[PDB]
Amino acid sequence: HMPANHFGPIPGVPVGTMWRFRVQVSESGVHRPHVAGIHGRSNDGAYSLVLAGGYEDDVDNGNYFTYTGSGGRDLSGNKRTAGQSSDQKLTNNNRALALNCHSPINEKGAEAEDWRQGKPVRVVRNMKGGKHSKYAPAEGNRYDGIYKVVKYWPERGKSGFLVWRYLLRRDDTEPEPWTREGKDRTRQLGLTMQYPEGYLEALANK
DNA sequence: CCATGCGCTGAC
DNA sequence: GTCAGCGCATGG
């Protein structure tokens, strides 16, 4: 049983694994938080993240992608999501993710002196990210492997407010689940969409 | 205690 | 199509 602050792959969970709901991704240990896009500790780093089209500044290009930090939002009224209404800060999860980069934390942003030496980050792609990405799975959530933070920096987002941006690159020995090799691999391993026990039946009665 | 939150579902 | 909020895990 891996501790909550484990870095790297989760034993027994191969690249290409799929789950229908976020709570299922949590139970596997791959990505503990069931709502937040980032799982991290401000004095340690980020352990994993999910691409789900929640932030307009996100850019997905497969082996490379640009992630936005969280926050700069007014969640008053017991919300979990909203548009940008204030500038983001390099604290909490945003600070946790910056620490993965192989360079001293820099309030103004920084680049890695040999990205590969950075802390590994488990990445999950959710289907809501398919609206603006051809890498997103058609259904559910999919584990795509290990990535590293090549660099991060602040800049005015499409909303006009300041947002934190991270450039992540894949560093995994397993073929991408979206390539020919990946799709064959998933087939040879017999991986299939996992659903909560009783879910398919409950939804079939409808 | 107290904030944060890239989900999810039932309503208009 | 879009939207108002709710339980709960995680961290400090």
Side-chain angles (χ1 to χ4, degrees), chain A residues 78-107:
Chain A
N78 193 24
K79 317 186 193 311
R80 303 292 175 277
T81 278
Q84 306 302 120
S85 55
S86 68
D87 302 319
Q88 301 195 325
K89 303 179 183 184
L90 195 66
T91 67
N92 310 319
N93 285 329
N94 295 358
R95 191 177 198 65
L97 189 50
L99 292 179
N100 289 61
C101 189
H102 194 227
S103 175
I105 177 67
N106 195 313
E107 217 64 33

Short mmCIF file of all heavy atoms in Angstrom, two decimals, chain A residues 78-107:
data_model
loop_
_atom_site.label_atom_id
_atom_site.label_comp_id
_atom_site.label_asym_id
_atom_site.label_seq_id
_atom_site.Cartn_x
_atom_site.Cartn_y
_atom_site.Cartn_z
N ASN A 78 -20.42 27.94 -1.98
CA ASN A 78 -20.12 26.51 -1.97
C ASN A 78 -20.00 25.91 -3.38
O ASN A 78 -20.73 25.00 -3.74
CB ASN A 78 -21.19 25.76 -1.16
CG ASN A 78 -20.79 24.33 -0.84
OD1 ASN A 78 -19.60 24.00 -0.80
ND2 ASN A 78 -21.78 23.49 -0.58
N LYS A 79 -19.06 26.44 -4.16
CA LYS A 79 -18.82 25.95 -5.51
C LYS A 79 -17.52 25.16 -5.54
O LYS A 79 -16.83 25.04 -4.53
CB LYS A 79 -18.71 27.12 -6.49
CG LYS A 79 -19.73 28.21 -6.27
CD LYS A 79 -19.65 29.27 -7.36
CE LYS A 79 -20.44 30.51 -6.97
NZ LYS A 79 -21.81 30.14 -6.49
N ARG A 80 -17.19 24.62 -6.71
CA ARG A 80 -15.95 23.87 -6.86
C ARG A 80 -15.24 24.40 -8.10
O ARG A 80 -14.04 24.21 -8.29
CB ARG A 80 -16.24 22.38 -7.03
CG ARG A 80 -17.05 21.76 -5.90
CD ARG A 80 -16.26 21.70 -4.59
NE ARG A 80 -17.10 21.22 -3.49
CZ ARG A 80 -17.93 21.99 -2.77
NH1 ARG A 80 -18.04 23.29 -3.02
NH2 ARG A 80 -18.68 21.44 -1.83
N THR A 81 -16.00 25.12 -8.92
CA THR A 81 -15.50 25.65 -10.17
C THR A 81 -16.13 27.00 -10.51
O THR A 81 -17.21 27.33 -10.02
CB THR A 81 -15.81 24.65 -11.30
OG1 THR A 81 -14.80 23.63 -11.30
CG2 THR A 81 -15.87 25.32 -12.65
N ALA A 82 -15.43 27.79 -11.33
CA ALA A 82 -15.91 29.10 -11.77
C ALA A 82 -14.89 29.71 -12.71
O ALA A 82 -13.83 29.14 -12.94
CB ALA A 82 -16.14 30.01 -10.58
N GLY A 83 -15.21 30.88 -13.26
CA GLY A 83 -14.27 31.54 -14.14
C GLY A 83 -13.21 32.30 -13.37
O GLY A 83 -13.33 32.49 -12.15
N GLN A 84 -12.15 32.72 -14.05
CA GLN A 84 -11.08 33.47 -13.40
C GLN A 84 -11.59 34.87 -13.05
O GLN A 84 -12.20 35.54 -13.88
CB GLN A 84 -9.86 33.58 -14.31
CG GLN A 84 -9.34 32.25 -14.85
CD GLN A 84 -8.97 31.27 -13.75
OE1 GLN A 84 -9.53 30.17 -13.67
NE2 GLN A 84 -8.02 31.65 -12.90
N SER A 85 -11.36 35.29 -11.81
CA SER A 85 -11.80 36.61 -11.38
C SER A 85 -10.70 37.35 -10.63
O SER A 85 -10.87 38.51 -10.25
CB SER A 85 -13.05 36.49 -10.50
OG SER A 85 -12.83 35.62 -9.41
N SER A 86 -9.57 36.67 -10.41
CA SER A 86 -8.43 37.26 -9.72
C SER A 86 -7.16 36.56 -10.17
O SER A 86 -7.22 35.49 -10.78
CB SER A 86 -8.58 37.10 -8.21
OG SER A 86 -8.49 35.74 -7.82
N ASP A 87 -6.01 37.15 -9.86
CA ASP A 87 -4.73 36.57 -10.25
C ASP A 87 -4.38 35.35 -9.40
O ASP A 87 -4.64 35.33 -8.20
CB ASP A 87 -3.60 37.60 -10.13
CG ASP A 87 -3.84 38.85 -10.97
OD1 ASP A 87 -4.30 38.73 -12.13
OD2 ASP A 87 -3.54 39.96 -10.48
N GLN A 88 -3.77 34.35 -10.02
CA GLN A 88 -3.36 33.14 -9.31
C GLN A 88 -2.10 33.41 -8.50
O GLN A 88 -1.39 34.39 -8.73
CB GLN A 88 -3.09 32.00 -10.29
CG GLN A 88 -4.28 31.61 -11.15
CD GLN A 88 -4.08 30.26 -11.83
OE1 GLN A 88 -2.97 29.90 -12.21
NE2 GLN A 88 -5.18 29.52 -11.99
N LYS A 89 -1.80 32.52 -7.56
CA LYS A 89 -0.61 32.68 -6.73
C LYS A 89 0.20 31.39 -6.71
O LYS A 89 -0.34 30.30 -6.91
CB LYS A 89 -1.00 33.05 -5.30
CG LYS A 89 -1.85 34.29 -5.16
CD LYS A 89 -2.20 34.53 -3.71
CE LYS A 89 -3.11 35.74 -3.54
NZ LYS A 89 -3.37 36.02 -2.10
N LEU A 90 1.49 31.54 -6.43
CA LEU A 90 2.40 30.40 -6.35
C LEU A 90 2.38 29.86 -4.92
O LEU A 90 3.37 29.96 -4.17
CB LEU A 90 3.81 30.85 -6.75
CG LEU A 90 4.81 29.75 -7.05
CD1 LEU A 90 4.36 29.01 -8.31
CD2 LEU A 90 6.20 30.34 -7.25
N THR A 91 1.24 29.29 -4.54
CA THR A 91 1.04 28.72 -3.21
C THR A 91 0.32 27.39 -3.35
O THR A 91 -0.03 26.97 -4.45
CB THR A 91 0.18 29.64 -2.36
OG1 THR A 91 -1.15 29.68 -2.91
CG2 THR A 91 0.75 31.06 -2.37
N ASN A 92 0.09 26.73 -2.22
CA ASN A 92 -0.60 25.44 -2.20
C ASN A 92 -0.20 24.52 -3.35
O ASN A 92 0.98 24.27 -3.56
CB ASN A 92 -2.12 25.65 -2.22
CG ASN A 92 -2.60 26.66 -1.17
OD1 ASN A 92 -2.12 26.67 -0.04
ND2 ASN A 92 -3.56 27.49 -1.55
N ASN A 93 -1.19 24.02 -4.08
CA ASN A 93 -0.93 23.11 -5.19
C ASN A 93 -0.04 23.69 -6.30
O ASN A 93 0.76 22.96 -6.89
CB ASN A 93 -2.24 22.60 -5.80
CG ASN A 93 -2.93 21.56 -4.93
OD1 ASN A 93 -2.28 20.79 -4.22
ND2 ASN A 93 -4.26 21.51 -5.01
N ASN A 94 -0.19 24.98 -6.59
CA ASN A 94 0.63 25.62 -7.62
C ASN A 94 2.10 25.60 -7.19
O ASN A 94 2.99 25.40 -8.01
CB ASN A 94 0.19 27.06 -7.86
CG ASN A 94 -1.22 27.15 -8.44
OD1 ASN A 94 -1.86 26.13 -8.69
ND2 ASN A 94 -1.70 28.37 -8.65
N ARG A 95 2.34 25.79 -5.89
CA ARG A 95 3.71 25.78 -5.39
C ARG A 95 4.22 24.35 -5.39
O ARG A 95 5.39 24.09 -5.69
CB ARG A 95 3.77 26.34 -3.97
CG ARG A 95 5.19 26.61 -3.48
CD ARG A 95 5.17 27.24 -2.08
NE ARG A 95 6.44 27.89 -1.74
CZ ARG A 95 6.91 28.97 -2.37
NH1 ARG A 95 6.22 29.53 -3.36
NH2 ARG A 95 8.07 29.49 -2.01
N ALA A 96 3.33 23.41 -5.07
CA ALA A 96 3.70 22.00 -5.05
C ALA A 96 4.18 21.53 -6.42
O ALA A 96 5.20 20.85 -6.53
CB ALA A 96 2.53 21.15 -4.60
N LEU A 97 3.46 21.91 -7.47
CA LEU A 97 3.84 21.50 -8.81
C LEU A 97 5.14 22.16 -9.30
O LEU A 97 5.90 21.55 -10.03
CB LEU A 97 2.70 21.78 -9.79
CG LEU A 97 2.82 21.23 -11.22
CD1 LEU A 97 3.18 19.75 -11.21
CD2 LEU A 97 1.50 21.45 -11.94
N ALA A 98 5.40 23.40 -8.87
CA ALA A 98 6.62 24.10 -9.28
C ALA A 98 7.86 23.39 -8.74
O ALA A 98 8.91 23.40 -9.38
CB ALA A 98 6.59 25.54 -8.80
N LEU A 99 7.72 22.79 -7.56
CA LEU A 99 8.81 22.07 -6.90
C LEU A 99 9.30 20.84 -7.66
O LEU A 99 10.42 20.39 -7.43
CB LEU A 99 8.38 21.64 -5.49
CG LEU A 99 8.15 22.72 -4.43
CD1 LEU A 99 7.72 22.05 -3.13
CD2 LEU A 99 9.42 23.52 -4.19
N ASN A 100 8.48 20.28 -8.55
CA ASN A 100 8.90 19.10 -9.30
C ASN A 100 10.01 19.47 -10.27
O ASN A 100 10.88 18.65 -10.59
CB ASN A 100 7.74 18.50 -10.08
CG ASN A 100 6.71 17.84 -9.19
OD1 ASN A 100 6.11 18.48 -8.34
ND2 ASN A 100 6.51 16.54 -9.39
N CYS A 101 9.97 20.69 -10.76
CA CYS A 101 10.98 21.13 -11.71
C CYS A 101 12.35 21.06 -11.06
O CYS A 101 12.51 21.43 -9.89
CB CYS A 101 10.70 22.55 -12.18
SG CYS A 101 11.75 23.06 -13.54
N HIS A 102 13.35 20.59 -11.80
CA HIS A 102 14.70 20.47 -11.28
C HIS A 102 15.40 21.82 -11.29
O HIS A 102 16.31 22.06 -12.09
CB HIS A 102 15.51 19.47 -12.10
CG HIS A 102 16.79 19.05 -11.44
ND1 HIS A 102 17.99 19.00 -12.10
CD2 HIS A 102 17.04 18.67 -10.17
CE1 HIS A 102 18.94 18.61 -11.26
NE2 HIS A 102 18.38 18.40 -10.08
N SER A 103 14.97 22.70 -10.39
CA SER A 103 15.52 24.04 -10.25
C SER A 103 14.95 24.62 -8.96
O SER A 103 13.89 24.20 -8.50
CB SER A 103 15.11 24.91 -11.44
OG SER A 103 15.52 26.25 -11.27
N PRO A 104 15.65 25.58 -8.34
CA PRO A 104 15.13 26.16 -7.09
C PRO A 104 13.82 26.88 -7.34
O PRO A 104 13.64 27.51 -8.39
CB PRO A 104 16.24 27.12 -6.67
CG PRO A 104 17.46 26.55 -7.31
CD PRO A 104 16.97 26.14 -8.66
N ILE A 105 12.89 26.81 -6.39
CA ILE A 105 11.61 27.48 -6.55
C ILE A 105 11.87 28.96 -6.86
O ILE A 105 12.65 29.61 -6.17
CB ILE A 105 10.75 27.37 -5.26
CG1 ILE A 105 9.44 28.14 -5.42
CG2 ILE A 105 11.53 27.89 -4.08
CD1 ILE A 105 8.50 27.56 -6.45
N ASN A 106 11.23 29.47 -7.90
CA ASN A 106 11.42 30.87 -8.27
C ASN A 106 10.09 31.58 -8.42
O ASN A 106 9.28 31.21 -9.27
CB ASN A 106 12.21 30.97 -9.57
CG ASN A 106 12.75 32.36 -9.82
OD1 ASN A 106 12.04 33.36 -9.69
ND2 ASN A 106 14.02 32.44 -10.19
N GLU A 107 9.88 32.60 -7.61
CA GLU A 107 8.65 33.37 -7.63
C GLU A 107 8.35 33.93 -9.02
O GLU A 107 7.21 34.23 -9.34
CB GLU A 107 8.77 34.53 -6.64
CG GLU A 107 7.49 34.88 -5.89
CD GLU A 107 7.01 33.74 -5.00
OE1 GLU A 107 7.87 33.00 -4.46
OE2 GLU A 107 5.78 33.60 -4.82
#
